[PDB]
Amino acid sequence: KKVVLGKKGDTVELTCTASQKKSIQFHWKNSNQIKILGNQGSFLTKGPSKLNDRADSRRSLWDQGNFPLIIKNLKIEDSDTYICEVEDQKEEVQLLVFGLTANSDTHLLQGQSLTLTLESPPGSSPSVQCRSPRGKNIQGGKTLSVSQLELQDSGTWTCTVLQNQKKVEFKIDIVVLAFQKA
Amino acid sequence: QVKLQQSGPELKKPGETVKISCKASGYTFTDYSMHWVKQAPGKGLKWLGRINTETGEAKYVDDFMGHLAFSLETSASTAYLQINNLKNEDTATYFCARYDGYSWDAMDYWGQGTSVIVSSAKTTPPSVYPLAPGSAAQTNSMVTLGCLVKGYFPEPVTVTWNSGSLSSGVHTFPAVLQSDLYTLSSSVTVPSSPRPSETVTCNVAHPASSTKVDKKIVPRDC
Amino acid sequence: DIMLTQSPASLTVSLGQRATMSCRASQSVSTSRYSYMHWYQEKAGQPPQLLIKYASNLESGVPARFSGSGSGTDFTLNIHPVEAEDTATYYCQHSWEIPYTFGGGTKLEIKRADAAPTVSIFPPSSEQLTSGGASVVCFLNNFYPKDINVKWKIDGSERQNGVLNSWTDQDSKDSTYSMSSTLTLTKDEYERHNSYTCEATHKTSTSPIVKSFNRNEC
Numbered sequence: 001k002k003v004v005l006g007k008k009g010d011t012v013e014l015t016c017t018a019s020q021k022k023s024i025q026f027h028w029k030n031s032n033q034i035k036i037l038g039n040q041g042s043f044l045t046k047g048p049s050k051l052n053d054r055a056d057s058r059r060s061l062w063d064q065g066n067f068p069l070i071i072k073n074l075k076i077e078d079s080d081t082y083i084c085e086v087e088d089q090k091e092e093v094q095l096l097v098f099g100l101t102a103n104s105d106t107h108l109l110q111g112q113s114l115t116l117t118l119e120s121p122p123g124s125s126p127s128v129q130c131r132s133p134r135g136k137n138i139q140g141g142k143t144l145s146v147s148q149l150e151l152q153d154s155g156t157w158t159c160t161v162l163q164n165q166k167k168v169e170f171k172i173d174i175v176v177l178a179f180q181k182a
Numbered sequence: 183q184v185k186l187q188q189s190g191p192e193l194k195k196p197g198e199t200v201k202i203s204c205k206a207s208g209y210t211f212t213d214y215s216m217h218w219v220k221q222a223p224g225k226g227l228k229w230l231g232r233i234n235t236e237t238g239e240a241k242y243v244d245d246f247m248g249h250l251a252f253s254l255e256t257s258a259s260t261a262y263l264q265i266n267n268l269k270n271e272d273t274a275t276y277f278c279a280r281y282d283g284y285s286w287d288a289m290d291y292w293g294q295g296t297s298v299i300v301s302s303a304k305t306t307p308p309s310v311y312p313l314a315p316g317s318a319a320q321t322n323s324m325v326t327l328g329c330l331v332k333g334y335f336p337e338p339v340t341v342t343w344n345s346g347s348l349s350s351g352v353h354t355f356p357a358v359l360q361s362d363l364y365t366l367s368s369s370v371t372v373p374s375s376p377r378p379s380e381t382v383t384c385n386v387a388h389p390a391s392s393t394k395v396d397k398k399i400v401p402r403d404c
Numbered sequence: 405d406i407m408l409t410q411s412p413a414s415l416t417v418s419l420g421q422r423a424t425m426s427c428r429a430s431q432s433v434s435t436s437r438y439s440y441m442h443w444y445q446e447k448a449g450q451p452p453q454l455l456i457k458y459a460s461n462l463e464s465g466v467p468a469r470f471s472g473s474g475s476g477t478d479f480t481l482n483i484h485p486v487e488a489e490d491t492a493t494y495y496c497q498h499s500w501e502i503p504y505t506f507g508g509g510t511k512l513e514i515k516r517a518d519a520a521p522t523v524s525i526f527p528p529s530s531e532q533l534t535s536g537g538a539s540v541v542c543f544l545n546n547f548y549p550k551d552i553n554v555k556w557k558i559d560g561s562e563r564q565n566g567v568l569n570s571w572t573d574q575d576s577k578d579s580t581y582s583m584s585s586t587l588t589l590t591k592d593e594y595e596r597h598n599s600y601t602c603e604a605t606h607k608t609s610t611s612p613i614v615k616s617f618n619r620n621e622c
Contacts (some may be wrong), residue, residue, distance in 0.1 A: 033215050035285075048285070049436055050435070052437055052438060084319060227444075227495055227497075227506040228505075239504060277451065277452075286458060286461075295451050311528075314526070318524075331528070353545055353572055354572075355572055355584040404622035
């Protein structure tokens with residue numbers, strides 16, 4: 001149904017709103033019937049979920065019918081279809097967690113090849129496209145490559161990932177040096 | 183207190199199909215994933231696959247396509263495991279089990295264990311031979327009697343003495359397969375007083391052929 | 405891929421002593437708060453049973469002498485003091501990421517003082533002789549260590565063919581082992597000879613324990 005995107009090692013808020021603006025009974029679980037967290041009595045409980053530590057909600061917003069799921073330090077394999085269950089509601093949200101790295105270590109050289117790689121989760125259709133500090137645009141799949149680097153490229157690169165109609169945007173600093181051999 | 187109840191043991195020839203069932207009674211079937219585990223003879227455990235009791239979706243790690251097909255019947259809280267192209271490797275003990283997704287229990291409830299036996303050999307009932315001292319010295323005081331259960335198929339065979347009244351000093355040795363036929367033996371050590379004076383009978387059962395034999399041990403000495 | 409490697413493969417320990425079994429994971433199966441590891445006990449020909457859940461929590465009923473520990477990639481169980489009923493194979497399982505794989509297992513045996521086998525020999529039954537078969541059975545009961553050798557002698561001559569041997573697993577009460585040796589002949593072969601002998605010899609023993617019967621003696 002609803003589809004949220006998120007960056008690696010980042011934070012995201014999955015929303016789940018039921019009617020009767022009040023602290024009623026609820027819980028979150030993933031696609032594999034594993035309780036992420038829920039309210040037992042009035043107190044927040046955390047389940048056997050792999051996310052046990054990095055998962056939390058927001059208590060004050062419970063009296064407003066809101067029951068948000070909050071996940072910090074997002075890893076990629078956290079990508080999944082999360083299910084919130086309230087009263088007789090089944091509100092589903094698919095989280096997809098992308099990441100972006102420069103597989104060329106760092107400190108590159110005029111003429112060398114640069115490659116940005118998109119760490120995507122299993123079973124995704126990402127369409128990336130970036131923008132150098134000049135204006136030129138490159139686009140591709142998991143692998144976007146710059147054949148041969150310039151000095152004008154030394155700066156901050158912006159990159160747009162598009163999943164479905166939603167999108168996330170990374171920025172990644174790259175430095176380029178010059179060299180000669182006489 | 184929940185409990186998982188599986189199907190009885192199975193005997194199938196190579197290349198046949200078998201469908202073992204597992205029924206959960208005690209909790210809400212659709213609120214817990216169900217996992218299957220295989221344990222081949224003399225080997226350790228090995229995880230097989232989990233099936234989502236809500237969606238029907240299952241993920242497994244079987245070699246070759248097909249061969250392993252998990253299914254459901256939510257209408258009767260029962261999960262199934264079907265093995266299509268049987269082999270001598272498939273001969274094993276199969277367990278289903280629940281995994282507590284709600285709380286900090288784990289594989290908290292398991293199944294009885296189904297025993298799939300794949301072989302071309304036909305079902306054969308055993309011969310029950312009593313083992314009595316020929317004419318050896320009475321020795322200390324504890325005379326040793328026995329029972330030889332020869333030439334049956336398939337497993338298992340169980341041996342008791344005096345309908346289980348004689349449990350001490352009893353040694354029932356594991357069966358050994360020789361040319362598509364098993365051979366098993368059992369011994370009992372009792373004092374020289376309770377025999378020949380009292381009754382000593384071995385009860386052997388081979389449920390595959392519905393055999394029941396109660397053999398009384400009587401002395402030889404010509 | 406998450407491989408669990410148990411060490412040792414087999415463990416021998418005397419009553420009252422400490423048994424230590426390790427389980428190493430190829431990758432971490434824990435998250436600061438908890439560790440997703442489990443221990444099972446599977447005695448001879450029994451189904452496995454959950455002992456420790458989530459690395460350190462004793463299952464209900466399980467005696468206090470059992471304990472589990474560890475985090476990340478390294479995990480340990482302890483059994484102290486070891487008891488007779490602890491003779492079994494013990495496995496380890498992670499619930500980190502499907503597949504929830506198992507370790508290779510570790511077989512625990514108890515070391516007791518050595519014992520001499522209660523030897524007993526049996527001529528073929530009259531029932532079996534009627535059917536044309538003739539099996540001579542010899543039992544070696546309640547000995548230790550398991551290292552034992554059995555020898556058959558038909559009329560003072562060593563016979564190797566047609567002998568099939570089987571042993572029970574370590575007993576849970578007295579911690580001894582046992583052995584069945586069955587010499588199968590045809591009735592014709594059987595009655596062509598007179599003296600039948602079963603000899604038990606250890607590596608850790610000088611005295612051969614012998615049992616015999618004469619066929620003509622009836």
